[PDB]
């Protein structure tokens, strides 16, 4: 069906709280070949984020129940994994075979590479052994590339740059097991944002302010 109606259905689905349907609608939109607008990119991420947010939370319940080690419980957790990976995989195909680089402006480029880092991160969480290592690498490289572009194209206050920095720091602490590096990135990301906020009008102040808060909360919890 027409791209415009796929987008409309994604919006209806979001109101109906049917994220799975929403994700599938945005996927159809993405496959149309046209670039996504800012609002459309947010629709795409909201969708899949909610879909995966549910699998993760479920996997984290089944894991603690299993106690990471100490039948049925094992079999079910693995099934939830397979599913999570499935969603992550279709998101990665969407980005690698459509969205990444097919874009022009810095913003979108950083947004998709960030998203790519985000889903490799979700794959990492449920991965063990060497698999996790390989996954952590490809997550790091995507986040880094996004970081390289944001530092070069956007100001310290751009919400997307902050989001990337925020998520990248979370990656260092929860996934890469490098707390110190995770803390310094967050500190720097936060400070550099401050010494530039005195000129940031509410035209976007709200945005950055929201993310800046999340950086200090993590900074506080990591200490």
């Amino acid at each position: 069906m027409e791209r415009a109606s796929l987008i409309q259905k994604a919006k209806l689905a979001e109101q109906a709280e049917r994220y799975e349907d929403m994700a599938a609608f945005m996927k159809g939109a993405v496959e149309k070949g046209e670039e996504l607008s800012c609002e459309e990119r947010n629709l795409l991420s909201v969708a899949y984020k909610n879909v995966v947010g549910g699998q993760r939370a479920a996997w984290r319940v089944l894991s603690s129940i299993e106690q990471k080690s100490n039948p049925e419980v094992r079999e079910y957790r693995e099934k939830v994994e397979t599913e999570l990976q499935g969603v992550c995989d279709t998101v990665l195909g969407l980005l690698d075979s459509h969205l990444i680089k097919e874009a022009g402006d810095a913003e979108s480029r950083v947004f998709y590479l960030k998203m790519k880092g985000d889903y490799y991160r979700y794959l990492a969480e449920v991965a063990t052994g060497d698999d996790k290592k390989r996954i952590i690498d490809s997550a790091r490289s995507a986040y880094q590339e996004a970081m390289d572009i944001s530092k070069k194209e956007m100001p310290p206050t751009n919400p997307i740059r902050l989001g990337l920095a925020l998520n990248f720091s979370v990656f260092h602490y929860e996934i890469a097991n490098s707390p110190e590096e995770a803390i310094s990135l967050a500190k720097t990301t936060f400070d550099e944002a401050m010494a530039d906020l005195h000129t940031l009008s509410e035209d976007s102040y709200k945005d950055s302010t929201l993310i800046m808060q999340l950086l200090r909360d993590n900074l506080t919890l990591w200490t």
Binding site: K49, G163, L166, N167, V170, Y173, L214, D217
Partner: peptide, 6 residues
């Protein structure tokens, strides 16, 4: 830890 979007 907090991530964005949430």
């Amino acid at each position: 830890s907090h991530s964005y979007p949430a």
